[PDB]
Amino acid sequence: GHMASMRIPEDVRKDIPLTNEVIYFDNTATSLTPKPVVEAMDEYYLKYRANVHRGVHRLSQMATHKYEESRKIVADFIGAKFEEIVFTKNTSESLNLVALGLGHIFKRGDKIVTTPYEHHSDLLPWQRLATKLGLKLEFIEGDDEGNLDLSDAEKKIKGAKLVAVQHVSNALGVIHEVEELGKIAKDEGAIFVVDAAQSAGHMEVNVKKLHADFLAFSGHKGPMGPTGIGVLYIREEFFDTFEPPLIGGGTIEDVSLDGYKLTEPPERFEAGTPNIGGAIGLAAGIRYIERIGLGRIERQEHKLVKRTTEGLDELEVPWYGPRNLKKHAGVVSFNVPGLHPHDVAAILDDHSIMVRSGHHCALPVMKKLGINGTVRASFHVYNSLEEVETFLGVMEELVKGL
Template identity: 45%
Template sequence: MSLNTEKIRKDFPILKREINGNALVYFDNASTSQKPQSVIDSISSFYTNSNANVHRGTSTLSEEASELYEGAHRKVADFIGADSIAEIAFTNNTTESLNLIAYSWGLNNLRKNDEVVITRMEHHSNLIPWQQICNKTGAQLKFIELNEDYTLNLEKAEEIMSSRTKLVSAVHVSNSLGTINDVKTLGKIAHDNNALMVVDGAQSAPHMEIDVKDIDCDFFAFSGHKMLGPTGIGALYGQEERMKELEPFNFGGGMISEVEYDSAKWNVSPWKFEAGTPNIAQGIGFGEAVDYLSNVGMNKIYKHEKELTKYALEELENFEDLRMYIPPLEKLAGIISFTMEGIHPHDISALVDEEGVAIRGGHHCTQPLMKLLGIDATARASFYLYNTKEEIDIFVEALKKARDLFK
């Protein structure tokens, strides 16, 4: 059964907005998603009724806040198939989750001549941390190349890994190309070489059913704000043994079990990674967002986005001056990156905004990938559960107006 988008759209107050006198068409979901009223209300309710610090006291409010915050961890753990909250540390976002691995594991375990393997399509958040950690430790950064159809060359990936490979980190879904990568196979290759497997799930967790045990990754990083939750909250999944092995890299209150003037012992996971007062309200909102997505059904959301993407591709193929940078449909998520002859992607984005359509123009935090493709930027439309085919029609008409204006 397909999604009842008419009913879903009523849950998102921002979709009632008009931009330049036109109904808002929000196709910038790869950047951040909109929020349902239930998520907004959960944050307001916490501050209105239960605001207190967590794990810091025995008052009724503190115990309520702690239960709500820990409950959010349990919801997120269940959402991705983790065994317990010991495997789920809340962070600020995917970027911090990946940096946590890089600093806590990378600095302590990588040595000269070790190798870290990532892909050519990585977001800066999964490139720069490993780039910098390799610079500090003397390890070598190696890259999995792309095929001509914008998919990963897994045969070459197997060839470049060896006993020197200590960690492989790959994006599950490319935010620039929309490519859905076979991270399960990539993880098997990594494990066959006794390397860890890290998955950047920022673009996959919001849009498809995730089972970290089936993927068999060591770590999985994702953000709340891309999956209907608030900004300022994300999560790092790590297999329980991996989380026990990791040293914290952020120190202070809440992450300790015992402190002396000259030494300290750490709290158990996940709390040893959540120093200081955490983003309590955002964490609760994250849990509510997971509830919303679970109630709708991730498989239904994935199917809906596939239908939208197929429809959009059929419409865009009528533009002779438009080039798309996407893999084949069966490996494509709800992201379409493109350029139009004679119009800069920034101008495309600005011109369709005149018609109320929000897309993204730029390098999408993948500057090296853009250079590899021989371009400066692309325009990017990205879909979610509240989008419709009628909105795609509006988008296509807005593109025609933009093209005619430049012609």
């Protein structure tokens, strides 16, 4: 897992056939998958297929070893300990598990604080908890670009029980000052939860630097892994507090008809046969990312955002999110005046340019901006400035087409 010499983006594109067929700017929805990751999964399926849990036999020994290796690889990627990594199906499961597993700690009137730009998965579970338990759900103030008011964050966070924030917005591309928010939460004694679904694999994600108590991410996005695998980081300090929401096979020490005994993390939290192929694929993605380097990925994406946003300004096409590109990830949301985003996306698709349109599972963002949705181009290290120029040529013809 060390960086290698390589040409970006050429050397990455070589491993991804779809890059030869379409201009894929829908990375926020899901990334394209490199051949080495598919080969790693295929190897499991065809060469060492077996359940884990240290079955006596050789195949289970090899699957168990690779599963464990994958969990270590994920731990190392985010700066956590092996035992603090739990595998889930996606970020959404991970976040819901936090709310279910911590539900018992709240008293009527306690406070939960989040941002107004959260993806539905990092809003709904907290709304349900607040409604059921009579809690206060408060939102840090921010502007239409996604920039949070840190003075308001300090006020809001004081006396909060739990703070949940996204690292990067999937609709705006704003990169929040998570390290600062985490500091405020820990200085105020609040539990700090981070939705890293749009940051992981696109920039540094480190639990210690973020002051995270819980952190969630999805394999299928930035990390260039498969679908059906997500991660939930649980800081060891919460092992005596967090109630496993899902229990059963693989989570126990002892069981009888009258009760049962739970084992230790991380198995205590992983009920049933895990997504063994998916964890292996994710580890593979992470290794692939490590070879490239998160610094190269960040830098490439910034070049793409810079040219895209500048192009759109030359076309008088309004774009959303921060103007300071230092705080803008590889996501450019925009709109063509007079045209519904779905129509724009359709035109782009006719030109083999894949973008997403709509509310992006972020209705409160759309409502705050007073818009119905946006068109969204989102990048990864394999996207090229040439593709951005094709895109801008198409948007130019669209715009002139009135």
